[PDB]
């Protein structure tokens, strides 16, 4: 479990960097939405975020932040395969693995997700902007980290 | 809360001090690299978890200070606490005391102030020297003159090395030891002495060693410093303070020179056979062979005794021992001190070292005793100078620095004034 | 109802103090955490003498501790039963004295006791009516003899008419553990005779003698020694806390055994003793106490009472026993021992009976005594003190701190009036 | 939000300004190209202070470099951080000042500055809330001194009420590396006192002394000399740009450090003089720091505190340190410095705490002060300037260009006016 845990700690450092650059990420998301001129629907797809970064990215720092966020998502997707082969698990473990796959899925939505109690992303982002436009993209990382910690605790409590 | 500050001046004091802090890290279980309450008395903490020793080594020659820098403990000692002397006094009292030492004595007080503000609570100062070295006799003298200026009442223990009665590695030692006693009388709080011959003699007949080094000497001396400071170092049944026995063991403003004696000096092969009772060790305490001052105890009169017991000792047979002691007629004390005894009891036994020659024993005992028999050694120190000063020997070396000519005889009158009172107080 | 305060002085006082509140917390059923768990309801009825009520059924001692060595106070902090003591009830100083009387009283005394009286008045006004004070001080130790007198002096000047019941350790022949002990002991008596209500001369040598000859322990460390000393204190102070068939509160105890305003030294004794040879061979009855009451093996002070007389003897017997059995055992020996007692005061013993026995024990007996055998202890203490001035030795530390030599001589004016007053009635 | 413009003159600050803009770019995580690769957005809120934005997400310098010798411009343009400055910031002339104040002022300076002054409106009018201007120059070099003081004249008249900060290197007692130093400095300080708000004095000799006695750097090249000078003025400006628990803007330092209008020469310092080999030997503690802000060695001029007189002191602390320990120890040191600080201004000092440290260091302090002994720095020039005019030296390089001899006699009176005021109000 330590081999996946090293990548988990690296992803924790990367998520800390993204939380520090949350304001820059929000500014980049607003600039991409203004360039795409489609503010009616909220951001819901990782594929939509990638398409926003490919064409509707304005600044070099914004492009770097979008690339860092996409690289964090790709590293999470790559570490999901290594976490899958750790243990066989129970039916609840399989359900949580399917939930992790759905959370890493680009086609699955993100607006219905919300930040956890330790996270302060809701306490940082704007009221209407996170309520209706881009709350889920900010909140997806901490819920995924909490689910990974819960899965690690479940595997630790589960006998091999 | 309590802390200890130690100053090492001279070639011996550096060489003696090397074995001392070797023991301190090993008793406290600290690696020489500087990492791993009871260590509060000797080490000041670094925010990364390191501890900086509270020891000051000042020497007028670099050849042994830089040797310490080549030791394994170079990752322990603070770089600014080692002061490199540009030129050595070379057993000339007036060189450091009047020409050479003024350049670097200003640097020493910067170290003292830096260590004092780091010290939130000060027990006292520890001073280490030998009576043969000019830096160990002269550079201390204007340091001990200086250490009275800033502080007047805090503890100052002048750990001394008395010259051996029959041998010496020096020639101008009767000049230097005379020049030592003038400053110690006027300024110094406490001063214990040992002589190299009895340190040579005990490791001959007790440890059965034919070929020691000076490290094999200084490992014994640092045990005494460990035993005296062990009350401040560790919680025990009867903890003592430096100011306590400075008030207690000293009788007079003139006489603050007691003797040192440690036990058990029993080797690792040797201790496996013995039966160690406290009555056994205290009967081994008062034998003249176990003292580290080669002078016959039956020449004078006993005045005081400090018995720093450490290990697993129960205070019953402690008291019956002194009662057994006081009955005998061979051991004579002074009538103006029928209460001439004090016993210290500390829980933790001393720790043996790898490569050492001592034994891992459950109980250890020290002796901090003053006796009027030391006049015979000091009568010799007056007589050796008298055989030297009659025909104006070696006067030219000291006077060339600038010190006056007739003031050599002033200390003779001052030494004889100290020697006059041993017939007054003693009789 | 009646509240009491425990002063403390000296490093040696800590080990006496820490074992004291260790012994008496057990006898009420208190854990070091501070949660009462016991069945006896009479303890909580009179728990307000010593402790102070806290939230959630916790109680905190009214113990005041003064010292100049944090290292033993750190041990008291790290002690097992020391975790019930109150934080500001500790009064600890950073600077030491050096086992000399002057440093604790004059130099370091000018600052630390201002932190003491604030702790006292904080504890004083929270009480109903303060019965008095206890201080465990010393005569051989420099700090305990030093501030203990100034602890006595300013409280007496602050509190006009109360009780002051102290426990002080006296010099001994063979357990001489300080050279300036005759210097420290004699001038401490100067502040005792004028200004102290009760002091109990416990001598170390008998404490060693009783653990060797009488309790027969193989390795009796000091924790055994303080186990006697604490129980001697509690025998004095169990009648104030516990009802008995014949109760005697401390004030009338202070009235009865203090006949004169000065000659109020006391010589304790407390012998429910049982050796490790003899758990079952004793016949634990009131008559065996009486033979053990006046045997020399049981008393706390290294003196032979056959060289004198007992002035006042109090025999508080605590346990289940009948008054007709109690008095008659002493009634016979008052008639029989017509020589060993004083003749100017007939009926030399007035007793007290307590019902509740100590925990871990069935029946126990105390002793409080003033006697006309304490001359030679006081005589031998004075004779070196005169002899230490002939050679004038060791006095320059006291002299060099700004003091007079006459203050060493004025005690000899006052101590000789103490020993000559014992000579008057003898 | 708050913007201030930097003008550059002389080859001196051309060597600081590459190192000085290294640190601010290092603090904001900026690559040598000029783009952003950082961790937080906190610096981006006030990254607009000394930059402007560019299209495509780029940040352009607010630093204009002017010299009459084009050699140092291109070297700065081709330096380690040479591809960052925008290419109209550089202005280069033809005939250098040649260490002559006259040459760079009237016959050659006037042709350059009119094109330079057009760059001033291009940079000033871009800023919304333009607080003022800074200028790094030299008193030893001709172009930095003579042409710099002309800029001091022209900018203040057109922009009257702003803040003018000058970080100027000053001539030294024993590192006098130009023959005309009392001619160059006096013809500038005649206009420096008149027309400058904030002036900072940098002594070369102390910088050599700092890197020797405490840093012990083996090869102190000018990259190391520019390193601390940049770091001191980096810590001055971080309270304007980076938020701290107790903040102070640039005018905030300007108002309180200046009691009288003609006394605005400041003496700075930087606190962590920690060596490369004894980082783990130092407890990273503010009780170490205060004796390091006020030691006999940590100053940056030839002005001893015992030869000086501390009117005002600003101690800008940088890093994560506690409030109470600093505030009491600042109260501590003013008390024990009874005769070192002045008496007619009680509560002399300002503490300043900025939360964010410099990179690679936990806590950091800058000691900035005004002392009368800057006149003792000046009296070395003053005893050298007056006697040199008596023997009629070097007039042809100056009086051959066209100024009358009378205002040179005004300067030795105007420089005498400055030292008269320090001496008058010293008592
Ligand atoms: N006990 C003990 N004595 C020592 C030791 N080393 C030297 N001595 C004694 O010290 C005396 C000389 O003192 P040193 O300190 O060696 O002389 P020094 O410091 O070189 O004096 P200078 O030449 O002026 O610098 C000799 O007579 C030795 O007996 C030691 O390690 N232990
Ligand atoms: N009852 C009792 N007496 C003790 C104990 N420890 C030491 N003493 C006595 O106290 C004396 C020393 O007192 P000291 O520590 O110098 O007093 P201080 O200087 O005020 O702390 C010795 O003579 C011992 O006989 C103990 O644990 N219990
Ligand atoms: N400490 C320091 N002094 C410098 C530096 N550059 C120049 N100087 C000083 O400035 C003087 C020369 O000034 P210069 O740079 O040529 O200015 P300019 O002639 O006006 O262009 C010399 O005496 C140097 O002491 C530097 O990088 N560091
Ligand atoms: Mg030497």
Short mmCIF file of N, CA, C and O in Angstrom, two decimals, chain B residues 119-199:
data_model
loop_
_atom_site.label_atom_id
_atom_site.label_comp_id
_atom_site.label_asym_id
_atom_site.label_seq_id
_atom_site.Cartn_x
_atom_site.Cartn_y
_atom_site.Cartn_z
N UNK B 119 21.66 31.06 29.62
CA UNK B 119 21.41 30.43 30.91
C UNK B 119 20.25 31.14 31.60
O UNK B 119 20.39 32.27 32.07
N UNK B 120 19.09 30.48 31.66
CA UNK B 120 17.96 31.05 32.37
C UNK B 120 18.13 30.98 33.88
O UNK B 120 17.53 31.79 34.60
N UNK B 121 18.94 30.05 34.37
CA UNK B 121 19.23 29.95 35.79
C UNK B 121 20.61 29.37 36.00
O UNK B 121 20.92 28.28 35.50
N UNK B 122 21.45 30.08 36.74
CA UNK B 122 22.86 29.75 36.86
C UNK B 122 23.15 29.20 38.24
O UNK B 122 22.84 29.84 39.26
N UNK B 123 23.74 28.01 38.28
CA UNK B 123 24.23 27.46 39.53
C UNK B 123 25.63 27.96 39.86
O UNK B 123 25.92 28.29 41.01
N UNK B 124 26.51 28.03 38.86
CA UNK B 124 27.84 28.54 39.08
C UNK B 124 28.76 28.26 37.90
O UNK B 124 28.33 27.76 36.86
N UNK B 125 30.03 28.59 38.10
CA UNK B 125 31.08 28.42 37.11
C UNK B 125 32.05 27.33 37.56
O UNK B 125 32.38 27.21 38.74
N UNK B 126 32.53 26.55 36.59
CA UNK B 126 33.47 25.47 36.83
C UNK B 126 34.78 25.80 36.13
O UNK B 126 34.79 26.08 34.93
N UNK B 127 35.87 25.77 36.88
CA UNK B 127 37.17 26.23 36.39
C UNK B 127 38.14 25.08 36.50
O UNK B 127 38.32 24.52 37.59
N UNK B 128 38.77 24.72 35.39
CA UNK B 128 39.66 23.57 35.32
C UNK B 128 41.05 24.02 34.92
O UNK B 128 41.21 24.74 33.93
N UNK B 129 42.05 23.58 35.68
CA UNK B 129 43.43 23.99 35.43
C UNK B 129 44.38 23.01 36.09
O UNK B 129 43.99 22.19 36.92
N UNK B 130 45.65 23.12 35.71
CA UNK B 130 46.74 22.42 36.36
C UNK B 130 47.74 23.44 36.87
O UNK B 130 47.83 24.56 36.37
N UNK B 131 48.51 23.04 37.89
CA UNK B 131 49.41 23.98 38.53
C UNK B 131 50.75 24.10 37.81
O UNK B 131 51.57 24.94 38.20
N UNK B 132 51.00 23.27 36.80
CA UNK B 132 52.26 23.33 36.06
C UNK B 132 52.25 24.27 34.87
O UNK B 132 53.27 24.87 34.55
N UNK B 133 51.09 24.39 34.22
CA UNK B 133 51.02 25.18 33.00
C UNK B 133 50.94 26.67 33.27
O UNK B 133 50.22 27.13 34.15
N UNK B 134 51.70 27.43 32.48
CA UNK B 134 51.65 28.88 32.60
C UNK B 134 50.31 29.45 32.21
O UNK B 134 49.81 30.38 32.85
N UNK B 135 49.71 28.92 31.14
CA UNK B 135 48.34 29.29 30.82
C UNK B 135 47.37 28.77 31.87
O UNK B 135 46.40 29.45 32.21
N UNK B 136 47.63 27.58 32.41
CA UNK B 136 46.80 27.05 33.47
C UNK B 136 47.01 27.70 34.82
O UNK B 136 46.26 27.40 35.76
N UNK B 137 48.01 28.57 34.95
CA UNK B 137 48.24 29.29 36.19
C UNK B 137 48.13 30.80 36.03
O UNK B 137 47.66 31.48 36.95
N UNK B 138 48.53 31.34 34.89
CA UNK B 138 48.50 32.77 34.69
C UNK B 138 47.25 33.25 34.00
O UNK B 138 46.62 34.21 34.46
N UNK B 139 46.87 32.59 32.90
CA UNK B 139 45.69 33.03 32.16
C UNK B 139 44.42 32.82 32.96
O UNK B 139 43.44 33.55 32.76
N UNK B 140 44.42 31.86 33.87
CA UNK B 140 43.31 31.75 34.81
C UNK B 140 43.30 32.92 35.78
O UNK B 140 42.23 33.41 36.14
N UNK B 141 44.48 33.38 36.20
CA UNK B 141 44.58 34.35 37.28
C UNK B 141 43.95 35.69 36.91
O UNK B 141 43.25 36.30 37.73
N UNK B 142 44.18 36.18 35.69
CA UNK B 142 43.45 37.37 35.29
C UNK B 142 42.06 37.05 34.75
O UNK B 142 41.26 37.97 34.56
N UNK B 143 41.76 35.77 34.51
CA UNK B 143 40.37 35.38 34.26
C UNK B 143 39.59 35.29 35.57
O UNK B 143 38.44 35.74 35.64
N UNK B 144 40.21 34.73 36.61
CA UNK B 144 39.53 34.65 37.89
C UNK B 144 39.45 36.01 38.55
O UNK B 144 38.52 36.27 39.33
N UNK B 145 40.41 36.89 38.26
CA UNK B 145 40.26 38.29 38.63
C UNK B 145 39.11 38.92 37.87
O UNK B 145 38.36 39.73 38.43
N UNK B 146 38.94 38.56 36.60
CA UNK B 146 37.87 39.14 35.80
C UNK B 146 36.52 38.58 36.20
O UNK B 146 35.52 39.31 36.25
N UNK B 147 36.46 37.28 36.51
CA UNK B 147 35.19 36.65 36.84
C UNK B 147 34.64 37.12 38.18
O UNK B 147 33.46 36.89 38.46
N UNK B 148 35.46 37.74 39.03
CA UNK B 148 34.93 38.38 40.22
C UNK B 148 34.28 39.72 39.90
O UNK B 148 33.40 40.17 40.64
N UNK B 149 34.71 40.37 38.82
CA UNK B 149 34.21 41.71 38.50
C UNK B 149 32.74 41.64 38.09
O UNK B 149 31.91 42.40 38.60
N UNK B 150 32.40 40.74 37.18
CA UNK B 150 31.01 40.66 36.73
C UNK B 150 30.12 39.96 37.74
O UNK B 150 28.98 40.38 37.94
N UNK B 151 30.62 38.92 38.40
CA UNK B 151 29.82 38.16 39.36
C UNK B 151 30.61 38.00 40.64
O UNK B 151 31.80 37.66 40.60
N UNK B 152 29.97 38.22 41.78
CA UNK B 152 30.69 38.21 43.04
C UNK B 152 30.41 37.02 43.94
O UNK B 152 31.27 36.65 44.74
N UNK B 153 29.23 36.42 43.81
CA UNK B 153 28.76 35.45 44.78
C UNK B 153 28.38 34.10 44.21
O UNK B 153 28.29 33.13 44.97
N UNK B 154 28.14 33.99 42.90
CA UNK B 154 27.78 32.72 42.30
C UNK B 154 28.98 31.77 42.35
O UNK B 154 30.13 32.19 42.48
N UNK B 155 28.69 30.47 42.28
CA UNK B 155 29.69 29.44 42.56
C UNK B 155 30.83 29.44 41.54
O UNK B 155 30.62 29.58 40.34
N UNK B 156 32.06 29.31 42.05
CA UNK B 156 33.25 29.25 41.21
C UNK B 156 34.15 28.14 41.75
O UNK B 156 34.85 28.33 42.75
N UNK B 157 34.12 26.98 41.10
CA UNK B 157 34.91 25.83 41.52
C UNK B 157 36.15 25.76 40.65
O UNK B 157 36.05 25.53 39.44
N UNK B 158 37.32 25.94 41.26
CA UNK B 158 38.59 25.89 40.55
C UNK B 158 39.16 24.48 40.64
O UNK B 158 39.99 24.19 41.50
N UNK B 159 38.72 23.60 39.74
CA UNK B 159 39.27 22.26 39.70
C UNK B 159 40.75 22.33 39.36
O UNK B 159 41.13 22.81 38.29
N UNK B 160 41.58 21.86 40.28
CA UNK B 160 43.01 22.06 40.23
C UNK B 160 43.73 20.73 40.13
O UNK B 160 43.21 19.69 40.56
N UNK B 161 44.92 20.76 39.56
CA UNK B 161 45.81 19.61 39.54
C UNK B 161 47.03 19.98 40.37
O UNK B 161 47.85 20.80 39.94
N UNK B 162 47.14 19.41 41.55
CA UNK B 162 48.28 19.69 42.40
C UNK B 162 49.52 19.00 41.83
O UNK B 162 49.41 17.91 41.26
N UNK B 163 50.70 19.61 41.93
CA UNK B 163 51.92 18.93 41.50
C UNK B 163 52.24 17.74 42.38
O UNK B 163 51.96 17.74 43.58
N UNK B 164 52.83 16.72 41.78
CA UNK B 164 53.17 15.53 42.52
C UNK B 164 54.36 15.80 43.44
O UNK B 164 55.26 16.56 43.08
N UNK B 165 54.37 15.21 44.64
CA UNK B 165 55.44 15.53 45.61
C UNK B 165 56.83 15.11 45.16
O UNK B 165 57.81 15.78 45.51
N UNK B 166 56.95 14.03 44.39
CA UNK B 166 58.27 13.54 44.01
C UNK B 166 58.61 13.72 42.55
O UNK B 166 59.79 13.75 42.21
N UNK B 167 57.61 13.85 41.67
CA UNK B 167 57.86 13.99 40.24
C UNK B 167 57.13 15.22 39.72
O UNK B 167 56.20 15.74 40.34
N UNK B 168 57.59 15.69 38.57
CA UNK B 168 56.94 16.76 37.83
C UNK B 168 57.46 16.74 36.40
O UNK B 168 58.61 16.34 36.17
N UNK B 169 56.63 17.15 35.45
CA UNK B 169 57.08 17.39 34.09
C UNK B 169 57.45 18.85 33.86
O UNK B 169 57.47 19.31 32.71
N UNK B 170 57.74 19.59 34.92
CA UNK B 170 58.01 21.01 34.83
C UNK B 170 59.17 21.35 35.74
O UNK B 170 59.57 20.57 36.61
N UNK B 171 59.72 22.55 35.52
CA UNK B 171 60.83 23.07 36.30
C UNK B 171 60.48 24.37 36.98
O UNK B 171 60.80 24.57 38.16
N UNK B 172 59.76 25.25 36.29
CA UNK B 172 59.37 26.55 36.84
C UNK B 172 58.04 26.42 37.57
O UNK B 172 57.40 27.43 37.90
N UNK B 173 57.61 25.18 37.81
CA UNK B 173 56.42 24.93 38.61
C UNK B 173 56.45 25.53 40.02
O UNK B 173 55.40 26.02 40.46
N UNK B 174 57.56 25.50 40.79
CA UNK B 174 57.55 26.25 42.06
C UNK B 174 57.37 27.74 41.89
O UNK B 174 56.87 28.40 42.82
N UNK B 175 57.75 28.31 40.75
CA UNK B 175 57.38 29.70 40.50
C UNK B 175 55.90 29.83 40.19
O UNK B 175 55.22 30.72 40.73
N UNK B 176 55.37 28.95 39.35
CA UNK B 176 53.99 29.10 38.89
C UNK B 176 52.98 28.82 40.00
O UNK B 176 51.98 29.53 40.13
N UNK B 177 53.24 27.79 40.81
CA UNK B 177 52.30 27.44 41.87
C UNK B 177 52.27 28.49 42.96
O UNK B 177 51.22 28.68 43.60
N UNK B 178 53.39 29.17 43.20
CA UNK B 178 53.38 30.33 44.09
C UNK B 178 52.53 31.44 43.50
O UNK B 178 51.72 32.07 44.20
N UNK B 179 52.66 31.67 42.19
CA UNK B 179 51.87 32.71 41.53
C UNK B 179 50.40 32.31 41.41
O UNK B 179 49.54 33.17 41.21
N UNK B 180 50.10 31.01 41.51
CA UNK B 180 48.71 30.58 41.50
C UNK B 180 48.00 30.93 42.80
O UNK B 180 46.88 31.44 42.79
N UNK B 181 48.67 30.71 43.94
CA UNK B 181 48.02 30.79 45.24
C UNK B 181 47.66 32.21 45.64
O UNK B 181 46.83 32.40 46.53
N UNK B 182 48.27 33.22 45.01
CA UNK B 182 47.93 34.60 45.35
C UNK B 182 46.56 34.99 44.82
O UNK B 182 45.79 35.66 45.51
N UNK B 183 46.24 34.58 43.59
CA UNK B 183 44.96 34.95 43.00
C UNK B 183 43.82 34.14 43.60
O UNK B 183 42.72 34.66 43.80
N UNK B 184 44.06 32.86 43.88
CA UNK B 184 43.03 32.00 44.45
C UNK B 184 42.63 32.44 45.86
O UNK B 184 41.46 32.33 46.24
N UNK B 185 43.59 32.94 46.64
CA UNK B 185 43.29 33.44 47.98
C UNK B 185 42.38 34.66 47.91
O UNK B 185 41.44 34.79 48.71
N UNK B 186 42.63 35.56 46.97
CA UNK B 186 41.97 36.85 46.94
C UNK B 186 40.61 36.81 46.25
O UNK B 186 39.75 37.65 46.54
N UNK B 187 40.37 35.83 45.38
CA UNK B 187 39.15 35.82 44.57
C UNK B 187 38.34 34.53 44.62
O UNK B 187 37.12 34.61 44.44
N UNK B 188 38.95 33.38 44.85
CA UNK B 188 38.35 32.11 44.43
C UNK B 188 37.44 31.51 45.49
O UNK B 188 37.76 31.52 46.68
N UNK B 189 36.33 30.95 45.03
CA UNK B 189 35.31 30.37 45.90
C UNK B 189 35.68 28.96 46.36
O UNK B 189 35.82 28.71 47.56
N UNK B 190 35.85 28.04 45.42
CA UNK B 190 36.12 26.65 45.75
C UNK B 190 37.19 26.10 44.82
O UNK B 190 37.29 26.53 43.66
N UNK B 191 37.98 25.15 45.32
CA UNK B 191 39.08 24.59 44.53
C UNK B 191 39.46 23.23 45.08
O UNK B 191 40.02 23.14 46.18
N UNK B 192 39.22 22.17 44.31
CA UNK B 192 39.65 20.83 44.65
C UNK B 192 40.94 20.49 43.90
O UNK B 192 41.16 20.96 42.78
N UNK B 193 41.78 19.67 44.53
CA UNK B 193 43.05 19.29 43.92
C UNK B 193 43.26 17.78 43.96
O UNK B 193 42.76 17.08 44.85
N UNK B 194 44.00 17.29 42.96
CA UNK B 194 44.56 15.94 42.94
C UNK B 194 45.98 16.06 42.40
O UNK B 194 46.33 17.04 41.73
N UNK B 195 46.82 15.06 42.68
CA UNK B 195 48.18 15.06 42.17
C UNK B 195 48.44 13.84 41.30
O UNK B 195 47.92 12.75 41.54
N UNK B 196 49.28 14.04 40.27
CA UNK B 196 49.44 13.06 39.21
C UNK B 196 50.05 11.76 39.70
O UNK B 196 49.82 10.71 39.08
N UNK B 197 50.82 11.79 40.79
CA UNK B 197 51.48 10.57 41.24
C UNK B 197 50.48 9.59 41.83
O UNK B 197 50.55 8.39 41.57
N UNK B 198 49.55 10.08 42.64
CA UNK B 198 48.55 9.18 43.20
C UNK B 198 47.55 8.74 42.14
O UNK B 198 46.98 7.64 42.24
N UNK B 199 47.32 9.57 41.12
CA UNK B 199 46.59 9.09 39.95
C UNK B 199 47.39 8.02 39.23
O UNK B 199 46.84 7.05 38.71
#
